[PDB]
Amino acid sequence: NLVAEPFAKLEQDFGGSIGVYAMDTGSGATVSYRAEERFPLCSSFKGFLAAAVLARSQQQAGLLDTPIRYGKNALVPWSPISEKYLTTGMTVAELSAAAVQYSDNAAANLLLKELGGPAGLTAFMRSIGDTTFRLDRWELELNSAIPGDARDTSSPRAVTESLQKLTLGSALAAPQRQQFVDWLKGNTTGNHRIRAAVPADWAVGDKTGTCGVYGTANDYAVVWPTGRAPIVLAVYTRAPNKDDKHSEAVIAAAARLALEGLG
Numbered sequence: 001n002l003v004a005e006p007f008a009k010l011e012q013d014f015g016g017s018i019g020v021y022a023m024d025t026g027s028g029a030t031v032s033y034r035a036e037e038r039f040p041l042c043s044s045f046k047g048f049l050a051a052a053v054l055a056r057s058q059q060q061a062g063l064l065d066t067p068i069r070y071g072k073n074a075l076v077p078w079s080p081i082s083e084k085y086l087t088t089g090m091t092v093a094e095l096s097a098a099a100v101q102y103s104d105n106a107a108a109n110l111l112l113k114e115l116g117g118p119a120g121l122t123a124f125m126r127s128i129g130d131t132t133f134r135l136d137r138w139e140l141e142l143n144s145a146i147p148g149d150a151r152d153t154s155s156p157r158a159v160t161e162s163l164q165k166l167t168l169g170s171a172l173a174a175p176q177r178q179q180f181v182d183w184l185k186g187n188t189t190g191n192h193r194i195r196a197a198v199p200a201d202w203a204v205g206d207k208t209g210t211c212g213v214y215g216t217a218n219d220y221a222v223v224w225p226t227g228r229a230p231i232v233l234a235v236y237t238r239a240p241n242k243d244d245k246h247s248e249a250v251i252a253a254a255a256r257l258a259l260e261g262l263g
């Protein structure tokens with residue numbers, strides 16, 4: 001597999017495993033490397049979380065506008081938006097934007113509670129035809145990224161296929177699809193990952209995940225090249241040792257090879 005060789009060299013230099021799946025929605029061309037292996041979701045589940053909330057909001061009038069007056073008991077390390085708005089409260093929309101664009105942990109747990117926990121989010125993903133995704137735990141425990149542990153994992157392919165359905169397909173009603181896309185486009189945490197691999201004039205929406213341990217980090221994105229059909233892709237990493245470091249540069253490099261390999 002000559003197409004795969006640059007990915008193999010990249011993961012070998014990295015000292016771990018890289019998983020990549022990219023699809024050009026105009027041509028149907030794909031690029032695949034370890035595309036069907038499981039990788040920890042880490043914070044990347046927060047994108048799909050927001051999508052599941054949006055789906056619910058279609059059936060529950062004023063859900064996204066509803067103020068949540070959470071207490072300090074809801075707060076978790078690295079919840080900068082939720083801590084800032086503790087004395088104000090936040091709407092469901094605002095919590096979703098915080099989870100997506102700042103990877104806010106408390107906001108993510110608050111929204112998970114609304115869906116009936118990790119099982120509720122998993123059930124939503126099953127409803128759109130994703131049989132791979134599983135979320136089992138809450139923030140921060142879901143980040144353990146233990147090699148061989150299937151909890152809180154998906155595959156680059158399933159992540160890409162689900163992202164396509166939600167952002168470009170018919171899984172959400174149109175206004176809700178647009179809100180999801182807009183939240184992804186406003187992400188603040190991904191500037192050194194897939195965004196670093198894309199020509200500066202192309203629009204990008206992404207969600208990052210960073211477990212930290214076991215060299216485990218990731219990003220998925222929808223990319224709109226000027227005047228062409230969008231591309232959807234996912235890049236996930238992991239490594240065998242607890243103190244192995246993740247690398248944003250490796251994620252960006254894998255993204256570049258994916259865009260180059262497309263037809």
Ligand SMILES: *[B]([O])([O])C1=[C]C([N+](=O)[O-])=[C][C]=[C]1
Pocket residue numbers: 042043044078102103105139140143208209210211
């Ligand atoms: B997540 O579960 O990768 C995650 C993200 C952050 N963050 O500050 O972005 C902290 C802890 C877990």
